Structure 1
Amino acid sequence: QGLMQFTLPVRLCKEIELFHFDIGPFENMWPGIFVYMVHRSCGTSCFELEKLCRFIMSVKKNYRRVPYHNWKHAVTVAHCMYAILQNNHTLFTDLERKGLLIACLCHDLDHRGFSNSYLQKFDHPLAALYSTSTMEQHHFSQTVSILQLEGHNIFSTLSSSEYEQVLEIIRKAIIATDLALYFGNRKQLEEMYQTGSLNLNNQSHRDRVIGLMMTACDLCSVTKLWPVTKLTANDIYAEFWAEGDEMKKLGIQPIPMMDRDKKDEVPQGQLGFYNAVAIPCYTTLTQILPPTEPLLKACRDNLSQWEKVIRGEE
């Protein structure tokens, strides 16, 4: 039984190829959507179906019921990566194709809905184990834990060598989702691209480009149709405000972004974020990988919808 091609209904079969695809509210379809993407992106031969299924279900089990950093976010970020891989077929190694979809599914494993900042101020044990990229080193750790469960080793056929390469791709990919690291990473990529020194044969260059891809997938809620973007924003701020509440409980005025008393300032907050983070991210990404331009175009569409919100045209 290896003639077992997963297939989706027609509207999903078609719209899954597009950057702006929303995976829907039917939680029980998300595993199938992921397997579909791995099979098309990687091959039906990349992974042992029974092992992959058991891995996916343990990954699912280890996401929490938080408003935003949940299992739906995991599968959403994996679909953005699938769209990028599918639009840039010949640029990526076999090991990269395998590693990056798994990295994406695992990148926020066991997230509690709190920032690295909050962990450090609370004095969480994870803050003493991991001084920087606190939640991200934890996510990678939880990824290795699950790969080491009996019957969960989806990489079992790789050589000793290929196995260490793939786990090194996953680790770098996951650390890159720490937005604090994004700014420097993109500045370097921008300067490399413009002085023409960017070289996809330099592993250290590839590493930077995969990190940017990871930021791009991770922020991909800004690249959706406006109603998806707007409703996802509600989940994002549900977390931010809970953390604000927890800051207040520690005796700390949170930043306004996290203060639920300053709801009125959200639209302006989203402008800043689109201008300082999202637009620059998708701009540099489009410079390096031209077929990713639809993510930049959709982001720009959403910036303009937030400007309309401010001007009371909605």
Structure 2
Amino acid sequence: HMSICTSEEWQGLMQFTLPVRLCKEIELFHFDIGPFENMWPGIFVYMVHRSCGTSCFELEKLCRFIMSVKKNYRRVPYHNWKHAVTVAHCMYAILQNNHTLFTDLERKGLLIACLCHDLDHRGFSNSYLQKFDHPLAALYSTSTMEQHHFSQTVSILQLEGHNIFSTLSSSEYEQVLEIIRKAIIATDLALYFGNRKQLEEMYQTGSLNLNNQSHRDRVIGLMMTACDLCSVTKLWPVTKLTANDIYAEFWAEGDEMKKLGIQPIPMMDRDKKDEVPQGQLGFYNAVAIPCYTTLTQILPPTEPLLKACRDNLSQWEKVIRGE
């Protein structure tokens, strides 16, 4: 039922070497992958090698995993392969700047989870699938898509010559699958508010214990959300272009409702496209700024993220005011 890669695809990836100029840039939080589409699979390999090591995964098995993952990402406007590598890059930048804060079993799982977190996205919300009783909503009652993304990840790893986590003991293997499970479920934005709530109180009262697994998993969750929203941390022209992509996806979902006689929420309605600048300001103020603020409080090296978020908020604020 999955979509395996061709021999051609993984072999070419194995041959790819990252140009020396982009070595500097890939270390920066505001790095846009956008202009280098042919390099995106190659960029993930680099990040995996630069973080955990050149001998952490079997190069053959790794290249087959990446290229098969790419094939299970649909041609949707925003929740595509480009997003999966943008999110992973941000995770790489965070994991680099907090090098001794996470175990090599967390480091491996976190990058793989970021590349897989939106696997098989059909450009529809959890609310859409529940409202139209889609077979996926029948399998997973809550965090519908996120539970499906995790199921597709597990299915890719279950393919011949794809299990990149096969060299781990049964204990070490079930441990990493759980890191990935939790990281992907955490990408369900509805769960985020509560997570950034509990993390805010835990930071204030100094109760956040990094040795406590339950507490550990909450930080990883926020790290996932911060990576998932990193489009608001890029330079203004990049940020502006990405906004157009997620709207195009939202509008297409609304169009599907309009066809059935249903009225979409303003966000999903393309006839309320002028409401987008105000909607962005609302999202940045209610979702993005709180996220990066708390992330910086827990992991201070992640400060540039919050800085770039603020810069873009100001840009949206200028758009509203008519520059």
Instruction: Note if contact 1:6-1:35 (Cα within 8 Å) is conserved in structure 2.
Output: no
- Judge which range, 125-134 or 21-30, deviates more: 21-30
Structure 1 pair 239/28, CA: closer, same or farther in 2 (3 Å)?
A: same
Instruction: Note if contact 1:256-1:262 (Cα within 8 Å) is conserved in structure 2.
Output: yes
Q: Choose the corresponding residue for 2:154, options 144, 150, 162.
A: 144
Structure 1 pair 28/288, CA: closer, same or farther in 2 (3 Å)?
A: same
CA shift digits 1:57-86 (9 cap, x unpaired):
100000000110000000010000000000
CA shift digits 1:115-134 (9 cap, x unpaired):
00111111100001100000
**Matching of residue 30 in structure 1 with residue 22 in structure 2:** no
Instruction: Note if contact 1:7-1:13 (Cα within 8 Å) is conserved in structure 2.
Output: no
Instruction: Note if contact 2:73-2:80 (Cα within 8 Å) is conserved in structure 1.
Output: yes
Report runs of 4+ in structure 1 exceeding 6 Å deviation.
1-6
Structure 1 pair 255/222, CA: closer, same or farther in 2 (3 Å)?
A: same
Instruction: Note if contact 2:69-2:156 (Cα within 8 Å) is conserved in structure 1.
Output: yes
Distance 1:115 1:11 in 2: 39
Q: How far is 1:288 from its partner?
A: 0.1
- Judge which range, 222-231 or 250-259, deviates more: 250-259
Distance 1:80 1:7 in 2: 21
Structure 1 pair 3/59, CA: closer, same or farther in 2 (3 Å)?
A: closer
TM-score, length-scaled by structure 2: 0.94
Q: How far is 1:11 from its partner?
A: 2.6
Instruction: Note if contact 2:186-2:224 (Cα within 8 Å) is conserved in structure 1.
Output: yes
**Matching of residue 250 in structure 1 with residue 257 in structure 2:** no
The alignment partner of 2:119 has SS state of: coil
User: What is the Cα-based RMSD across aligned positions, in Å?
Assistant: 1.9
The alignment partner of 2:232 has SS state of: helix
Q: How far is 1:26 from its partner?
A: 3.2
Q: How far is 1:249 from its partner?
A: 2.0
The alignment partner of 2:259 has SS state of: helix
Tell me how many residue pairs correspond in the alignment: 313
Distance 1:251 1:116 in 2: 20
Q: Identify unmatched segments of 5+ residues in structure 1.
A: none
Structure 1 pair 5/44, CA: closer, same or farther in 2 (3 Å)?
A: farther
CA shift digits 1:9-63 (9 cap, x unpaired):
2331100000010113332211110000000111111111000000001000000
The alignment partner of 2:114 has SS state of: helix
CA shift digits 1:237-292 (9 cap, x unpaired):
00010111112223221110111001110000000000110000000000000000
Distance 1:6 1:36 in 2: 10
Q: How far is 1:7 from its partner?
A: 4.4
Instruction: Note if contact 1:5-1:44 (Cα within 8 Å) is conserved in structure 2.
Output: no
CA shift digits 1:84-121 (9 cap, x unpaired):
00000110001001000000000000000110011111
Distance 1:185 1:40 in 2: 30
**Matching of residue 183 in structure 1 with residue 172 in structure 2:** no
Instruction: Note if contact 1:2-1:44 (Cα within 8 Å) is conserved in structure 2.
Output: no
Q: Identify unmatched segments of 5+ residues in structure 2.
A: 1-10
Structure 1 pair 150/117, CA: closer, same or farther in 2 (3 Å)?
A: same
Identity percentage of aligned residues: 100
Instruction: Note if contact 2:44-2:89 (Cα within 8 Å) is conserved in structure 1.
Output: yes
Q: How far is 1:8 from its partner?
A: 2.1
Instruction: Note if contact 2:13-2:63 (Cα within 8 Å) is conserved in structure 1.
Output: no
Q: How far is 1:178 from its partner?
A: 0.1
Instruction: Note if contact 1:244-1:254 (Cα within 8 Å) is conserved in structure 2.
Output: yes
Structure 1 pair 43/249, CA: closer, same or farther in 2 (3 Å)?
A: same
Structure 1 pair 6/46, CA: closer, same or farther in 2 (3 Å)?
A: farther
Instruction: Note if contact 2:14-2:59 (Cα within 8 Å) is conserved in structure 1.
Output: no
- Judge which range, 243-252 or 81-90, deviates more: 243-252
CA shift digits 1:146-194 (9 cap, x unpaired):
0000000000110000000000000000000000000000000000000
Q: How far is 1:4 from its partner?
A: 8.9
Instruction: Note if contact 2:13-2:41 (Cα within 8 Å) is conserved in structure 1.
Output: no
Match of 2:119 in 1: 109
Distance 1:63 1:232 in 2: 17
